Design a protein around this ligand. Sequence first.
Ligand code: CDL
Ligand code: CDL
Ligand code: CDL
Ligand code: CDL
Ligand code: HEA
Ligand code: HEA
Ligand code: 3PE
Ligand code: 3PE
Ligand code: CA
Ligand code: CU
Ligand code: MG
Lengths: 53, 206, 50, 671, 51, 346
Amino acid sequence: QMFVARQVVTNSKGEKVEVLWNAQCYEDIAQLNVGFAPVLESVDYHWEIFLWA
Amino acid sequence: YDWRDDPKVNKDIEEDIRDRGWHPETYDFPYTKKHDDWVFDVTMPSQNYQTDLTVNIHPENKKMHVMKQVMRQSYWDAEHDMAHEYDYESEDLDFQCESFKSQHFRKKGPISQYLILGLLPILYFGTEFFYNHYPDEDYWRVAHPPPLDYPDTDDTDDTETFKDYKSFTGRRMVDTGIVDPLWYDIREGKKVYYDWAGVNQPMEDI
Amino acid sequence: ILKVARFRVLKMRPKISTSYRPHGKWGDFLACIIPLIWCINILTNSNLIL
Amino acid sequence: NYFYYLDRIKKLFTYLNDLRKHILKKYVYTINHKRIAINYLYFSMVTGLSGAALATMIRLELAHPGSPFFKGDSLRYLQVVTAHGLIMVFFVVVPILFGGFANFLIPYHVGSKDVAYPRLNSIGFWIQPCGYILLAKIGFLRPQFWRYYDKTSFSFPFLEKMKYNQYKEYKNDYLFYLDFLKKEITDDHSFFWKARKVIKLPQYSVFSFVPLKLMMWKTMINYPESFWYAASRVVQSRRKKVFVTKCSARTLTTAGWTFITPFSSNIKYTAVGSQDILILSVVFAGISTTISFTNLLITRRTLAMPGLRHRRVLMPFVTISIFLTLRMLATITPVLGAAVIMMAFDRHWQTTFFEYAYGGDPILSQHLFWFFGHPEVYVLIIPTFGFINMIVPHNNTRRVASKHHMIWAIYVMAYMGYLVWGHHMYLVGLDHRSRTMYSTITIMISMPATIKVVNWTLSLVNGALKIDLPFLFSMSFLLLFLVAGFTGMWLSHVSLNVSMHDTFYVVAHFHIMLSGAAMTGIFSGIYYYFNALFGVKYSRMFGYMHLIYYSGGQWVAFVPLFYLGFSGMPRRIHDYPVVFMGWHSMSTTGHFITLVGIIFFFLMMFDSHIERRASTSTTLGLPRWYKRISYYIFKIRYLQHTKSKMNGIPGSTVRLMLINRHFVEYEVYEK
Amino acid sequence: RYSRNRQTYRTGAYWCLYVNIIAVVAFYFWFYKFTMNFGYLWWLLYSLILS
Amino acid sequence: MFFELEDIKRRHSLYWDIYNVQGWVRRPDSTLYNNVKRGVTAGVVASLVQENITALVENCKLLATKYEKPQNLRQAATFMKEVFKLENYRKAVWNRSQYALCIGTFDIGARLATFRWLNNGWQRVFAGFEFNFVRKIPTTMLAALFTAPFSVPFELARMAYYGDKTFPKELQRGYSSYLSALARIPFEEGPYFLFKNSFPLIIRNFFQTFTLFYTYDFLKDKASFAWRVGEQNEYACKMIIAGISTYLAAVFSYPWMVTREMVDFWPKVPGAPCTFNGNYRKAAVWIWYHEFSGNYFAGFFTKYFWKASPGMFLTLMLADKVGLFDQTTVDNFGGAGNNSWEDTFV
Ligand SMILES: CCCCCCCCCCCCCCCCCC(=O)OC[C@H](COP(=O)([O-])OCC(O)COP(=O)([O-])OC[C@@H](COC(=O)CCCCCCCCCCCCCCCCC)OC(=O)CCCCCCCCCCCCCCCCC)OC(=O)CCCCCCCCCCCCCCCCC
Ligand SMILES: CCCCCCCCCCCCCCCCCC(=O)OC[C@H](COP(=O)([O-])OCC(O)COP(=O)([O-])OC[C@@H](COC(=O)CCCCCCCCCCCCCCCCC)OC(=O)CCCCCCCCCCCCCCCCC)OC(=O)CCCCCCCCCCCCCCCCC
Ligand SMILES: CCCCCCCCCCCCCCCCCC(=O)OC[C@H](COP(=O)([O-])OCC(O)COP(=O)([O-])OC[C@@H](COC(=O)CCCCCCCCCCCCCCCCC)OC(=O)CCCCCCCCCCCCCCCCC)OC(=O)CCCCCCCCCCCCCCCCC
Ligand SMILES: CCCCCCCCCCCCCCCCCC(=O)OC[C@H](COP(=O)([O-])OCC(O)COP(=O)([O-])OC[C@@H](COC(=O)CCCCCCCCCCCCCCCCC)OC(=O)CCCCCCCCCCCCCCCCC)OC(=O)CCCCCCCCCCCCCCCCC
Ligand code: HEA
Ligand code: HEA
Ligand SMILES: CCCCCCCCCCCCCCCCCC(=O)OC[C@H](COP(=O)(O)OCCN)OC(=O)CCCCCCCCCCCCCCCCC
Ligand SMILES: CCCCCCCCCCCCCCCCCC(=O)OC[C@H](COP(=O)(O)OCCN)OC(=O)CCCCCCCCCCCCCCCCC
Ligand SMILES: [Ca+2]
Ligand SMILES: [Cu+2]
Ligand SMILES: [Mg+2]
C-alpha cells in the first residue's frame, strides 16, 4: 500500500536512480490508505489528516 | 511477568482462533511491520520446471497449510492512550511536535455498547410506544369485549340487540343474509361470545 | 444489463479502461430527444384537455 | 500493606476520573471535524429512529378506516404527520448530508486542516437536539394535556382568582374593611362541588362531593405539588367510541409542514401551541442552516488546496453536489425566514399580512414558502447523485461517464428550480400565464435528469466490475430514482395534476423520491466510507439483508400509494373510505419491511464492531488500469492475495473426494 | 499560514447547551405553558446540588 | 412463602378497546392434544417420504458406483428395478422408516405443535393483508429455539447405529434395529453420548424450522394478492411459496452443517494446532465471518439439499392442509369486530 512497484532507471547524467510507484486513490483521500508498512490492510486510522497543518 | 496473563501457561484463557497470528498489543502506531511477502511451494513450485519434460505440475494436489486469518484491528490501551492525549493546561505550549508518533490514532475498544447500538431500534420503539404508553394504554393491551351492558346501555346495547335478533324482524333480516348471525349469547347474567366470533370473552368485573 | 452481468466481471472479461477524460459534446442533445418527445406528448394532451 | 484492596480501588477511581476527562476533551469539547461528523451520524440515527416511529404511527392509523390508532384524534394525527415530515426533512437528511457527510468529507476533498470555522461546526452540531425535540415531541405534547376523562372541575376552582377578587379592593382601602367583614359568609375561603350523582336520601339535606384526594388538608398542606392529582385519572368511567371527542379545543392542531394560511397564521383555526412552536423551530433551523452553509462555503473558498481552488471538476461529485446545495440553501433561506416571521407576526400581533380583508394575500404565504420548498427538495436530492457517481467508477475501475455534463445538468436543475415553485400552486387560482410558465419549466427540468440517468447507465459498460454492497445499493437507488422521476414528470401534466393534487399519488411520488433514492444513496455512502468512519470492515451478511429488506419495504410501501392516488384518496386524512383497506394494508406491510431492514442495518453495525477486523482496499492501490503494466501489476498482486487467502482450505481433489464419499450409512457389508 | 488554533471549545459547547435549554424551555413555557417538574426525577436535581 | 421468590397474584379492573379483533385471541382448536396430534401426523407423513427418497437415492448411488449409470429410458428402468430388488435397499428402507417414525413424531411434530401454540392467535386483517409481522417474529423465534435440540439425540443414535454395523464382529454392538439402538445407547454410553458436541445439529434445526415456518407464514398471506386480486391459482401459488421457503431453509441451514467436514474431515497440518481447536461453534463463527460464500457452500446439493429440503416442503404442504397455518379473520366493523357501531356506516 506504500508503493505498488519500483524501477531503476539511468538518467541522462549517467546516474542510476530508483523510481517508486505510489499507491493511488480515486479522488478520495478518505478512501486513500495512509500507511507506513508493506501491508494492504488499512491499519492506521488518523484523526488529523494533516497533523502539522 | 505474570503467568495468569499468559495463554500458554494459563489454560483458562479462551484462545480466539479468528485472531491467530495477530497481537494488537504489539502494534507500533504507526504500524510499521511487514507480515506479507511472496509465497510459493503452495500451488506454484519455487523451483524451475518449465522445460522439464518428465515433470508435469498438478495444482490440484495442493497441500493444506496454516489458516491465515484476516488482520485484527488495533485495540486501545486505556492508560497509554489517556497519557498520550493528556496535555498540561498552563504548562504546555500550544504547538504540534515534529514527531509523527504524536498523531492521535483510533483504536477499537469495548464492544458491549455496540449491542445496545444494534438493539437500538427495538429499544427506541419500546420507549416510544410501550414505555410512554402512546397513543394510549389500551391500544397495545390484549383486546377484550366490554362486559354485558357495560359501561352503559346506550353504549353497549347488548340486551336490545339480542331481543332484536330474536324478534321476527331480526330473523327475517338474517334470512335475507345482509345481517350476519348473532355472535354472543346472554347466559344467566353473563354474555358469552361464540367460539366462531373470533374474540376473547369479556374481562371479569371483579 | 445482460452483457454487464455476464462478461464485465473481473472473473470473465475485465477491460483495461485507458481513457483519461470524457469527450462528449452533443450526446446530451442526442439523448434528450426521448424526454423531449415525452414533454411534447404531455403538453399536447394537457392543452387538448384544457 | 494492610490496604492493598484500597490501593486497587484508588487506582480504579483515578482511572475513571482520567477517562471522564479524556472523554469530555475528545468527544464533547473537541473541534475535530471527523469526531463532529461521527457524533452527527449518531444523532442522525436517533432522529431517523424517531421519524420511523412517527411513520409507524401514521401507517398504523391508516391501516384500516375507523382510526384504530388515534381513535378519532384528527388533530393529533395531523400533528404527528407534520412532526414526521419536519423531522425527516430538516433533521434526518440534512444532518446526514450536511452534518456528518459534509463535515467528514469536505476537509478531505479540499485539503484543509479543519473547517474555516471549527467553532461554528461544533455549534451547528450541538444546536440540533433542541430543534429535533421541538419538532418531534409535538405529537405527545398538547396545550390541553389532560385526557377526556380527567375531571378538571376538581382542580380549576383552586386556580380561579376571581373568587377572592373582593378582598383585593379592601387590601388597599381599609375604610370599609370592617363593614365588609360584617357581611354574611356564603363561600369565603370554601369550595363546594355540586352533586355529580343523583342521590335520594331524605335523612340528609346536603351531600359532600369534595375530591377524595383533597378530602384531608393535613397531607395537602406540606405537599409541594399542584392540585392536579385529585383530577388526574380518578374515575373509572370511560367511553370507547370514535365519535367521542378527546380534545375539547378543536383548534389545537397543525397546518402540516406547508404552513397554509390563514389556517396556519390565525389562532382561530390553529390555536396557540404546536403551530407557534413549529414556526419558531423553522426559523431556528433556518438560522442553523445559515451557520452551517456559511462555515462550509467559506471553508471551501478559503482553505481549498492549491490547484483545486476553482477546478470544480476534479473534486469528487459528492463534494460538488454538497457545495451546490449549500449555495441553494443560502439563496433560499432568507425567503423562508421572512415568511415564517410574517406568520408569527400575524399569529401574535395580528399584522394581517395574510388576511384578505384589509390587503392581506393568503397566496403570498404559499408563494414564499414554496419558493424555498422546491429548492429544499432539490437540495435534498442533489447530494444523493454523488454517492453513485463516486461508487460506480470505484467498483468498475473506470472513469465516470461525462462528469462535466453531469455537473452542468445538476447545476441547471439547481438554478432552474427557482422558477417552478408554482407547480405546488397550480389550482390555488394563479394566473394562467404564470401557471403555463411553471408547467413549461417543470417539464423542461426532466431533460438533465435523463442526462444523468444515461451517464449512470454508460458508466457501467466496458469496465472491470467489482461487485460490492455499495454497488448494489447504487443499483437500487437508480431503480427507485427512475420511477420517482417518471412519476414526477407525470405529475407535471397539468390536466392530471388537477386530479392528483393533494392526493396520495403525490405522496407516493415524493416518497419514492426521498425515502427511496436519498436513503439508498445515504446507505451506499455509509458502506463506502464504513472503514473511514468506524475503522473496521462491515459485515456483508447483515449488509445484504439490510439492502434486500429496505429496498423491498420501500417498494411495497410506496407502490400501492400510487394505486390509492389513482383511486382518489386525499392527503392528511386519518379515516378514509373502506375501498382503500387492501392498499393501505400493503403500505403498512411495506413500512414494517423497511423497519426490519433498519433492524438489519443496526445489527450489521453491531456485528461489524464485534468482528473488529481491519479493512483492505479492493483496488489494492491501483484504482485505474490506465496502462497494461498497471493491469499486470494488479493481476499479479491479486493472484498472490487470492492464493494467500485460499492457503487454509483443502485442494479441489480433496474437497471433491470428501463430498463424493461423505455418505457412510449402509446396512450390509462384507462386499 | 494560519497560527496555531486551540483544539477544544468548552465555552462553545456549554453555550450551545444553554441555547438548546433556552429554546426548549422558552417554547414550552410560551406556547405550551409547561415547565419541567424537576422534582419528579429528584436525583438529578440532587446531583446538581451535590456537584 | 413456598420458597425464596414469591409469585404475587394481583387483580385488575375492567378495560376494553374500540376494536376486539386483529390482536391475539387463542383459537379453540389451539390445544395441547389437537396441536400435538396434527404436528405429529404431518411430521411423520413428511419424514416417511423424505427418508424413503434418501434411501432410494443412496442405493442408486451405491449401485452406480459399481455399474455404469443409465444410458437411456430402458436402462434407467432396469437400473431402478435392480435398485428396488437390492437386498441392502429393503433393509435401508425399513431402518429409515423407523427413523422417520421417530423423527416426525418427536422433532417435526414438536416443532409444529410449538409453532401452533405460539402463533395460533395472531389474527389477520379482514379484506387486507396482515401487518405487524414483527409481533409474530418473537413467537417463531421462541418456538424454533425451544424445538431445535429435539432431533440431535435421534440423529446421533442413527449415526451410532450405522457406524456400529461397519466394525468387526468383536467390536460390534449388534443392534437389532434403529429402535433397539436408540433404546440401548442411553444405558450403554450414557445420555450425554447422544448430545455431546450437538451445536451443528442444533443450529441447523433452528435455522431450518425458523426460516421455514416464519417465511411460509409471511408469504402465504403477503403474496395472497396474486389469487385474491389477480385470480391466480391459489394451490399453485402456495406450492411456489413452499418451494421458496424450503430452498431458503436449505440455503440458511447447510453452511452450519458444513462445520462437520471442516473440523473432522479436512486434513490436519502436521505439527500445527487445529485451525478451529475442534470447536464447531468457532468453525461456525469463522464461516459466518468468511468473505467467500462458495467455499462453504460447496457440496450443497450432493450432500444436504436432497436429504433435507423435500421433507421440509412436504411438512409445509401437510401443515397447510391440516390447518397449522390457518388464522382467524373477522370483519372489524362487524358485530364482534368493534364496540363502536355508530360510525361503521355514518
Ligand atoms: C446554602 C445555599 C447554597 C449556597 C452555596 C452555593 C449554591 C449554588 C447554587 C447555584 C444555582 C444555579 C441555578 C439553579 C437553577 C435550578 C432550577 C430548578 O430546578 O428550579 C426548580 C427547583 C425544583 O422545582 P420543581 O417544582 O421540581 O420544578 C420547577 C417547576 O417545574 C417550575 O418552577 P417555577 O415555575 O417556579 O420556575 C422556577 C425554575 C425554572 O423553571 C422553569 O423551567 C420555568 C422557566 C420559565 C422561563 C420563562 C421565560 C422563557 C425563557 C427565556 C426568556 C428570555 C428570552 C430568551 C430568548 C431570546 C428572546 C429575544 O427555576 C427556579 O426554581 C429558579 C431558581 C431558584 C433559586 C435558586 C438559586 C440558588 C442560589 C444561587 C446563588 C448562590 C450563590 C450565593 C452567594 C454565596 C456566597 C455568599 O427548585 C429549586 O430551586 C430547588 C433547588 C434549590 C437549590 C438551591 C442551591 C443548592 C442548595 C440547596 C440546599 C441544600 C442544603 C444546604 C445546607 C447548607 C449548610 C451550610
Ligand atoms: C425457549 C426459549 C426461546 C428463546 C428465543 C430467543 C430468540 C432470539 C435469540 C435467538 C438466539 C439465541 C442464542 C442463545 C445463545 C447461543 C450461544 C451459542 O451458540 O453457544 C452455546 C453453545 C456453544 O457451546 P460450546 O462450549 O461452544 O460447545 C460446542 C458444542 O458443539 C456444543 O456444546 P456441548 O456439546 O458442550 O453441549 C451441548 C449441550 C446439549 O444440550 C442440549 O441439547 C439441551 C438444550 C440446550 C443446549 C444449549 C447449550 C448448553 C447451555 C447451558 C446449559 C443449558 C441447559 C438446558 C437449557 C436451559 C437453560 C438455558 O449439552 C449440555 O449443555 C448438557 C447436556 C446434558 C445431556 C442431555 C440431557 C437433556 C435433559 C434431559 C432431561 C430433561 C428433559 C426431559 C425430561 C423432562 C421432565 C419429564 O452451543 C450450543 O449448545 C448450541 C447453540 C445453537 C445456537 C443457535 C440457536 C439455537 C439455540 C438453542 C438453545 C436452546 C435449546 C432449547 C432449550 C432451552 C429452551 C427450553
Ligand atoms: C435491478 C438492477 C438494475 C440496474 C442494472 C445495472 C446493470 C446490470 C447489473 C450490474 C451487474 C450485476 C451482476 C450480478 C451477477 C454477478 C455474477 C453472478 O452470477 O453472481 C454470482 C456472484 C458470485 O460468484 P463468484 O464470485 O464466482 O463466487 C465465488 C465466491 O463464492 C465469492 O462469492 P461472494 O463472497 O461474492 O458471495 C456470493 C454470495 C453472496 O451474495 C449474495 O447472496 C448476493 C445477495 C444479493 C441480494 C440482492 C439481489 C436481489 C435479491 C432477491 C430480492 C427479490 C427480488 C429480486 C428481483 C427484483 C429486484 C432486483 O451470493 C451467492 O451465493 C450467489 C448470488 C446469486 C447469483 C445470481 C445469479 C444471476 C446473476 C445475474 C443477475 C440476476 C438478476 C435477477 C435478480 C437477482 C437474482 C439473485 O455474486 C456476486 O458477485 C454478487 C452479486 C450477485 C447478484 C446480485 C446483484 C445483482 C442484482 C442487483 C439488484 C439491485 C436491487 C436490490 C434490492 C432488491 C429489493 C427487492
Ligand atoms: C421477483 C423476480 C425474481 C427474479 C430473480 C429470481 C429468478 C432467477 C434469476 C436468475 C438466476 C437463476 C437462473 C440461473 C441459475 C439456475 C440454477 C443453476 O443453474 O444452478 C443449478 C443448481 C443445482 O446445482 P448445480 O449448480 O447444478 O451443481 C450440481 C453439482 O453436481 C452438485 O452440486 P453441489 O452439491 O456441489 O452444490 C453446488 C451449488 C453450490 O451451492 C450454492 O451455491 C447454493 C447457494 C446459492 C446462492 C443462494 C442465495 C441466492 C439465491 C436466492 C436469492 C435470490 C433469488 C430470490 C428469488 C425470490 C423468489 C422469486 O451450486 C449452486 O447451486 C450455485 C449456482 C446456482 C445457484 C445460485 C445462483 C443462481 C441463483 C439461485 C437460483 C435458484 C433460486 C431458487 C428459489 C429461491 C427463492 C428465494 O441450483 C439449483 O438447481 C437450485 C435451484 C432449483 C431448486 C429446485 C427445487 C426447489 C424446491 C425444493 C424441492 C424439493 C423436492 C420436492 C419437489 C416437488 C415438486 C412439485
Ligand atoms: C427528493 C425530493 C424530490 C425530487 C427530486 C422531486 C423532483 C421532481 N418533482 Fe416533485 N415533489 C416533492 C419532492 C421531490 N420532487 C415533494 C415532497 C412534493 C410535495 C410537497 C408537499 O406538498 O408536501 C412534490 C410535489 C411535486 C408536484 C406537485 C404535485 C401536486 O401538488 O399535484 C410536481 C408537479 O409537476 C412535481 C414535479 C417534479 C419534477 C418534474 C421533478 C424532476 O426533478 C424529476 C425529473 C426526473 C425524471 C422525469 C426522470 C426521467 C425518468 C427516466 C429516465 C426513467 C424512464 C423509465 C421508464 C418510464 C420506465 N413534484
Ligand atoms: C426525508 C423525508 C422523508 C422520509 C425519509 C419519509 C419516510 C416515510 N414516510 Fe413520509 N413524509 C414526508 C417526508 C419523508 N417521509 C413529508 C415532507 C410529508 C408531507 C407531510 C404533510 O404534508 O403533512 C410526508 C408524509 C407522509 C404520509 C402522509 C400522512 C398523511 O397525509 O395522512 C405517510 C403515510 O404513510 C408517510 C409514510 C412514510 C413511511 C412509511 C416512510 C418510511 O420510508 C420510513 C422508514 C424510515 C426511514 C426511511 C429512515 C430511517 C432512518 C434511519 C434508519 C437512520 C439512518 C442513519 C444513518 C444512515 C446514519 N409520510
Ligand atoms: C425497527 C424496530 C421496530 C419495529 C416495529 C415495531 C412496532 C411495534 C412496537 C414494538 C417495539 C419493540 C419491538 C417489539 C417487536 C415484537 C413485539 C411487537 O411488535 O409487539 C406487538 C404486539 C402487540 O400488538 P397488537 O396488540 O397485536 O396490536 C394491535 C392490537 N389491536 O406485542 C406482542 O406481540 C407481544 C410482545 C411482548 C414482548 C415485547 C418486548 C418489547 C421490548 C421493547 C424495548 C423496551 C425498552 C424499554 C426501555 C425502558 C428504559 C427505562
Ligand atoms: C402488490 C403491490 C405492492 C407490492 C410491490 C409492487 C411492485 C410492483 C413492481 C412492478 C412489477 C410487478 C408487477 C406488479 C405488482 C403485482 C401485481 C399487482 O399489483 O396485482 C394486481 C394484478 C391484478 O390486478 P387487476 O387486473 O386490476 O385486478 C382486477 C380484478 N377485477 O395482479 C395480478 O394480475 C397478479 C400478478 C402477480 C405477479 C407478482 C409478481 C411479483 C411477486 C414476486 C414474484 C412472484 C413469482 C411467482 C408468481 C406465481 C404466479 C402463479
Ligand atoms: Ca384509519
Ligand atoms: Cu417543487
Ligand atoms: Mg393542495
